[PDB]
Amino acid sequence: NDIRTAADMEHCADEKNFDCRRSLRNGDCDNDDKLLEMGYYCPVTCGFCEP
Numbered sequence: 001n002d003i004r005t006a007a008d009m010e011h012c013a014d015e016k017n018f019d020c021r022r023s024l025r026n027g028d029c030d031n032d033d034k035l036l037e038m039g040y041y042c043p044v045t046c047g048f049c050e051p
Contacts, residue, residue: 012049020045 014020020028020042028034029046038046 012043014045015041018042
């Protein structure tokens with residue numbers, strides 16, 4: 001009955017088609033220019049969300 005379940009973004013996952021591992025070692029999470037790309041492509045890999 002709680003409407004807090006309307007949000008389905010509670011679970012974040014890394015992109016399967018995006019190489020977050022390579023982007024992570026490349027410091028992609030440390031690049032402000034890619035910070036948005038990580039929150040979108042690999043929010044979990046950069047530590048912006050949970051798996």
